[model samples]
Target: APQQINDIVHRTITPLIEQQKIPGMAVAVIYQGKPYYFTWGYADIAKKQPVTQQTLFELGGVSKTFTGVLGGDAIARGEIKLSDPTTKYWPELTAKQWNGITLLHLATYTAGGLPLQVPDEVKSSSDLLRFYQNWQPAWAPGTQRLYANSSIGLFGALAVKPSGLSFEQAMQTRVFQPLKLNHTWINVPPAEEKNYAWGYREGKAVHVSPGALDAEAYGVKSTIEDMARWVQSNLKPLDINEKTLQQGIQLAQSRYWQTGDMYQGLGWEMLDWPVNPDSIIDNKIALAARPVKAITPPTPAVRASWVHKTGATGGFGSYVAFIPEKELGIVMLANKNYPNPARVDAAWQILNALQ
Candidate 1:
């Protein structure tokens, strides 16, 4: 069955690498509670190195999924509150309104349209601190969902400070170590440096360049084996040693908000089970700010939908999706940054093969 699945994935993914010119890819699948791993193409084209079990791929924005978990962790521990004003984290910033933006706003990309990236001029944390100190939202915090790394990045960084641990430390202790994710890393250590795959951009070898909240926003690198474990972790708890961490994972996976069909969790987004992942990416409103009215009461995390998130660095791309309906999930990581829809199409096709 595993071999058959591998063949199906190859048939679905081979054309993607060929047409997209992707340098390397690591794909992982969890089906019927069994894990499957596959690697293809080259980690370094000129070096003639192929991706191996040790090779790590950048998770891109999918790293935000982990950030969401950290936020869930903080809330679970009562270290923070979703309704707490952003000012609570750093009293230095004043709000335009008496109510102010909440930590929930930042974690959900609904912090009144903070932009997709921090302005290039904002080079240092000090720069960002001052910029946000005087910042005004384009709209009310809860009204619109404008995807931005800066907002989530700030929240991720701020949420961990109370633990007296840097974002990296908090993730290591609270998320990675407790979950037994030995191979996943926010910072790929020097000892494991050789395992880091060289990402590709425009036919050239490249890797992520750290800048402004990069660590908190999207600095995860891991192998297919670890990612497969990650999917299983989301599918069902995996002997989590810490209760708060476990609760956080559960919360992160649950639906925290909805405006009609837009189902959002702490980090994961839930689409109707039969929906096309492609259409989700193609929607312009998803890229630009679009007003959404939260279903005031919100809903619980049910397995009847497609839960997923995707991310991309300048040189790498990642897609993760799972249908609780089938007890199936797939992770697609490529060294070359590819279209969001392209990644989804690959997963969509491969998973559809099982049907």
Candidate 2:
């Protein structure tokens, strides 16, 4: 990592954020077990107050990490199995072709098809049951990759209900409480309203529809402090046992399907970034053509030896990634809609600088 890159990153990315009209964001990094922090712009734009290390932001799809943790914890406790049929746990589904859908498939997004966003057919848990029962896949399972939210959202609901808990309660008991993440929530609590970072869309605070796919696909929100803690856990996994932590890591990164240089994991995409260019560059050279991987990297060089998960909603954009070998992790959260290149790019630049 270059020492000078930190200053350059801060200088380059911050102004670009302002120029791009993003509201504000917080960046936190964990090397080994310690946290390093940076804040740029405002937590509250109307007051012009600056974001702090403790500020919370809508985590968007980054919340899936929480769902992953929930699943892993349940399996650890013998409450769930990755291979269990979805119909077995949630008897409410319409039950046409759902017999083939398994917990593993949903976890990997290989069961249902991929759409950029889940349709409005699913607004709540019950809506999900009806949607999955009637939904049909365009291709055979595991034959292709589709980043569908419906599959995972149902998985979240199924995982919790069978355990006799709500999705929110199960996550709180399994991941949040044990991890001491006080500020994170799957559903916003009325008491935390003041601390809740206001979401923005197109440069202004606005009412945004919850384009999320319930608790499994989205819904988890957290502060920078909780996110930093989650990042640290990824760098050095806690709750190691016969059941949970190691398996969680496995389920998250294990390749379930492949397309060119990219592979799909339970809820994450396996990318052989710049350092591990073999996956893509080799494919490009061998085939003389390249297909777009599901997601893009913040920087070309940063892609190698890295795995990442990204989340975006009407008013939030979030990214989290870690290099296990280097024991490095980076997290960024912004309260703005559309996308923020600086939030994504600066995280990688800072990760490189840390090394």
Candidate 3:
């Protein structure tokens, strides 16, 4: 790291350590295909356990990017197409709104509309299909974007069936097997319980509980090392088809919608920082440097831009951000559910420091 940048990071992170008040953290940065990794604090602070490169963390929404990559790979193998409708696999879904939804829309989060969380009344895949069959869209299909977790999660689960696999099996076969990421697992096996990192809640340690796992929206636990490889794959187009890789990266990099002036991409929420008030795009609507009236764009906003994804659960808070153009990536994972505001500040501090 440059001397000036290093100073910036130290100055910013030092205070965050006190503010967030977490025991410790692990950070990994990849530049020019090399890794600069550091662990500070403790993985098990109660026991004075020090964080290691091997310590695992729940990777929250970061799992979505992995699912996107696998979806891209399947497209490359001629087993699927992004333009394919979701109903192909779930033919039982007889909704008119679902008819126009394509895999591209699901991957990019432009589905006519799916709720943030499906109602409790609906459970299991079959129930989900029935729910959508009658669910009405708030806006025209592919015309609006809402950060719908249920939508993305259903996309991940329903997506694999057409490819002749389950969501978890699809990940193992298409992604993990190719990347040799032994530390990444969606449904962690019982034998590995000893190595699981305990998550902290309310200043006290709590056993991390597993929630609903969705390869598309959120499902998977990974270490900084495994994530480093994932960063490499993103930074450098890999064994997958060049076009397919572009599609995946484009979803991350392209500005998919403009609210007023800000652009949003697939699974990624964007902010053009350092500009006064900051510009952001959420749910295909761009806000001009500040939160004003939200406006939906007539079409997906287009731009070459920076990318980031964040994941948080009861006991874990993790973040991943990288500018593909700069070939720079950063991964931050903590064992506690610390405040995200301070966490993002830390990430930006490190990013600015690296510059």
Candidate 4:
């Protein structure tokens, strides 16, 4: 199986980079609690810096999964309830569209008509609140699933509000410190700036530019080594001694809703475990081409599931997925925004081989 993994990476990943002209990429796979890493290209094309376990890449929307975990952690600590209305934390939020919306809806990307991007006019928290006051849902809350960054961004802010800590501080204390993820951060430390990979778009350097809600939506930066630890934590959460952390990890991975062919968890996508990798790749591609509408029955058809998330910014792309039942997971980060289906296919190939 290990040999097969090597063969698959060489046969598949090599051509993928060549065809896409990816300047740099880092990949890590966890099997039975052990990590195996593979890297290619250069982290900085001009400087010829090689991508390594320590190279940091923008996580893009995969950052939402971290926010989702924070929400779960808050729920585990009894700081918040999934059914609680947004007004519970922000009492001033009194828009009619906010009536039935709950923390769960936001975490699951079902917050009615929230868009994928924050309104340009919403330049601050106060501005966001003003926008919500007049915002009307395109559909009733919980009636449809729309992939929305604004929803989760608000959820992240609310998740830490009860704890009396800023979102960055809360995440560092509740998740990063506890998990020992030293190289992960909402903002990269100056000392490690050299390790931060500069992303490219169409052969020009265009690093991620932070925005108002970027920290909750797409601002995380992390190294492959740190991401491998995250994968292992999800794979074997019982190994984590913190009870609330364990609970949060489980909750984040559990299914919350089903939207068409895609199954939604708190911050992760759910898929049937023991599935055909090709099917996963196919569905990933289809989801990208079509708009997703909410489907009924929050529970997935599969009893066993894999949890996954994909993220892309202007110039960076990332994907993380794992099957707890198999103790197998993969993290793929690249400096160029490649297609999600390519990442899915490569990860599935290696994971299937491990199986």
Per-residue lDDT of candidate 1, residues 1-355 (tens digit): 4777979988888899899888788888888868887888888788888998678999988888899888889889989887888888887676564256888888887888887777778887689887786667778778888778888988897898778888898888888887778999977889987788898887777888877888778889988888887888777653566888778877787775665566778778887778765555532234666676675665656777788998888789999988776889899988988777788888888877775
Q: TM-scores of the models, in the given order?
A: 0.94, 0.83, 0.81, 0.93
Off by over 4 Å in 2: 1-9, 112-118, 121-126, 207-213, 238-246, 273-305, 338-344
Which is the leading candidate under TM-score? Answer: 1
Per-residue alpha-carbon lDDT of candidate 4 for residues 1-355, written as tens digits (9 for 90 to 100): 3776667667777888898788999888888878888899888888888998899999998898888888889999999987899999999997677888988888877777777778676787788889878877777777677787888888888888889999999999999999999999999889998898989998887778767788988999999999999989877878999899888887787666655445777777887776665566632342232234444434532335667888898889899988877778889899998887788877787777777
TM-score of candidate 1 to 2 decimals: 0.94
Top lDDT model: 4
- The residue-by-residue lDDT of candidate 2 on 77-175, one tens digit each, is 678887788777877775666667788777766664634456765666566556666777665554454555666776777778667987777778777
C-alpha lDDT of all candidate models, in order: 0.81, 0.66, 0.65, 0.82
In model 1, the Cα lDDT at residue 242 comes to 82
Error of 4 at 177 (Å): 0.7
Per-residue alpha-carbon lDDT of candidate 3 for residues 104-221, written as tens digits (9 for 90 to 100): 6676656765666567566565676677788887666667666666666766776566678878888887778666788898877787655567778887776544333354676688
Alpha-carbon runs more than 4 Å astray in model 1: 95-98, 238-241, 282-287
Q: Listing every candidate in turn, what is its Cα RMSD in Å to the true structure after a full C-alpha superposition? A: 2.0, 6.0, 4.7, 2.8
Task: Tell me the deviation in Å of residue 206 in model 4.
Answer: 1.6
Model 1 Cα shift for residue 347 (angstroms):
0.9
lDDT score, residue 316, model 4?
Answer: 95
TM-score quality measure for candidate 4: 0.93
